[PDB]
């Protein structure tokens, strides 16, 4: 059934699984027309498909041409997500295909179930976790490849950089979700924290800076403070 705080370690067992987040698939800017009406303009989006054990991110870039001439785009976007995830699974060798796909939003369940009818043994699950994957477009290198795309494209990343050489996948996932939660609650501050010290750099083949173990403890503490702050600044506490 649903994934929650009670079965959290299941994410890091040896059964292949993927999270799918669709919150950046259909993206628009809202603007005024010369006549004073409101219209939207689509911008490039992305499906966020993540193996939480290995860090492998399958970033399917959704180019704005996919929406041309289509109606009910918020609904279509869920079915397009499900089509692309199904296509990804079929493209993988059998021994790499997931045993479970966990969707971050319950509205993805029926679209994905219908597109995966050919895979009756792959479980499609919701989650009660409130995961911050919408903030993926606050990672500069991910936002860059999405906005620069001129056609549909799939880009592969490891969202943990080389962390698994030193920490476990439970701890790497916890670090990732803290970074993304911070970026979601106050992007400017979060990014200040991450890049303040110009002697720590981002390797060309990485997404995050090359912090030492001790520096990560400091960074992680600053992100907790930020989230607590904003939680205060928000509710006045």
């Amino acid at each position: 059934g649903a994934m929650n705080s009670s079965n959290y370690a299941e994410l890091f067992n040896n059964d292949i699984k993927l999270f799918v987040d669709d919150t950046n698939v259909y993206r628009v800017t809202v603007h005024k027309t010369f006549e004073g009406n409101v219209a939207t303009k689509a911008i490039n989006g992305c499906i966020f498909t993540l193996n939480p054990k290995t860090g492998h991110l399958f970033l399917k870039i959704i180019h704005t041409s996919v929406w041309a001439g289509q109606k009910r785009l918020s609904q279509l976007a869920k079915w397009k997500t499900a089509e692309e995830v199904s296509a990804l699974v079929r493209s993988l060798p059998k021994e790499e295909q997931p045993k479970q796909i966990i969707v971050t939003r319950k509205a993805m369940l029926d679209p994905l179930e219908v597109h995966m009818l050919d895979f009756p043994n792959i479980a499609i699950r919701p989650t009660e976790l409130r995961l911050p994957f919408s903030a993926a477009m606050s990672i500069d290198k991910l936002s860059d490849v999405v906005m620069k795309a001129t056609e549909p494209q799939m880009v592969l990343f490891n969202i943990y950089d080389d962390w698994l050489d030193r920490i476990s996948s439970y701890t790497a996932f916890s670090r990732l979700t803290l970074l993304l939660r911070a970026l979601k609650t106050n992007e400017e501050s979060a990014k200040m924290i991450l890049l303040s010290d110009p002697t720590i750099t981002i390797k060309s083949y990485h997404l995050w800076p090359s912090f030492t173990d001790e520096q990560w403890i400091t960074i992680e503490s600053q992100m907790r403070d930020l989230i607590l702050t904003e939680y205060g600044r928000k509710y006045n506490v």
């Binding site: 279509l76 079915w79 499900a82 089509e83 029926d110 679209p111 179930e113 219908v114 597109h115 009818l117 050919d118």
Partner: protein, 300 residues
């Protein structure tokens, strides 16, 4: 006008015949039901006074044979049987009528209710849903499960309704996933009507039979099938105009006949609200929508 005699009534029982019912006391001198209209299927059904558990009964068509009821004290139920000796049967019936030991099928001349509930129901199709080929009549009860229910356990005692599943490869064309799931017309028209049922009369017949088994026996599986067949039509954007008009009449008389107090067990809130207010056919079921709103406005 045909007759279903009873050998006797050894246990106290409520007896139904179609939409009518009456109480018989233990060892009361009751010997059956006369003046049964020719031209329709019928159902004769039972609820024992001492164990209201297991409503059970028999679908039959008097044109197909001479049928009677006899209690079996070993299996503990009223059984339908066929009498092949036509002269024995006519002599039994004539004697019971002479002694006025039979209730009369109490049809009002103005009243088309039973026709309107069984318009498309055929005994030959009932016998394919309820498989027991050695008898011309068909037994149903409250507990019998459907083939679909068994897949999610005795196959000889199952209701073999046509399986309908909106998230199945049968329902969903590869490459038309969104289209077929949000508009079920290809599943309705090509798969079910053209492919399985052959025509809308057979579809409506099964829909009507499933309703009647739900109502008369509280058969949960039958109730599920009735709603699934309604939902498949309502969730199709392209339905022949004659089918929508006939569906409106079918459902109108089903809702009219339902006991006012059983609306919580025999009506599915989700299906009816979806069908009447959100579906492609939300504006095509005027008679049904009107009686539903005036009789069961709570459900909505």
């Amino acid at each position: 006008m045909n007759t279903v005699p009873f050998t006797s009534a050894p246990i106290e029982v409520t007896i139904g015949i179609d939409q009518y019912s009456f109480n018989v006391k233990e060892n009361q001198p009751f010997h059956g039901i006369k003046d049964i209209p020719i031209g329709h299927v019928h159902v004769i059904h039972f609820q024992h006074a001492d164990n209201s558990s297991m409503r059970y009964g028999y679908w039959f068509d008097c044109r197909m044979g001479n049928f009677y009821i006899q209690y079996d004290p070993k299996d503990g139920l009223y059984k339908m049987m066929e009498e092949r000796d036509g002269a024995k049967f006519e002599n039994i019936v004539h004697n019971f009528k002479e002694r006025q030991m039979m209730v009369s099928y109490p049809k009002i001349d103005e009243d088309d209710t039973w026709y309107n509930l069984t318009e498309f129901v055929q005994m030959d199709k009932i016998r394919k849903i309820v498989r027991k080929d050695e008898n011309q009549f068909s037994y149903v009860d409250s507990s019998m499960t459907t083939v679909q229910e068994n897949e999610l356990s005795d196959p000889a005692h199952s209701l073999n309704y046509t399986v309908i599943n909106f998230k199945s490869r049968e329902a969903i064309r590869p490459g038309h996933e969104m289209e077929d799931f949000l508009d079920k017309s290809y599943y309705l028209n090509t798969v079910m009507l053209q492919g399985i049922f052959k025509n809308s009369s057979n579809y409506f017949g099964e829909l009507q039979f499933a309703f009647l088994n739900a109502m008369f026996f509280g058969n949960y599986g039958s109730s599920l099938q009735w709603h699934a067949m309604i939902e498949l039509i309502c969730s199709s954007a392209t339905v022949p105009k004659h089918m929508l008009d006939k569906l409106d009449e079918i459902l109108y008389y089903q809702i009219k006949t339902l006991p006012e107090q059983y609306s919580d067990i025999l009506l599915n809130e989700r299906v009816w609200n979806i069908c009447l207010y959100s579906s492609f056919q939300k504006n095509s079921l005027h008679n049904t929508e009107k009686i539903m709103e005036n009789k069961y406005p709570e459900l909505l």
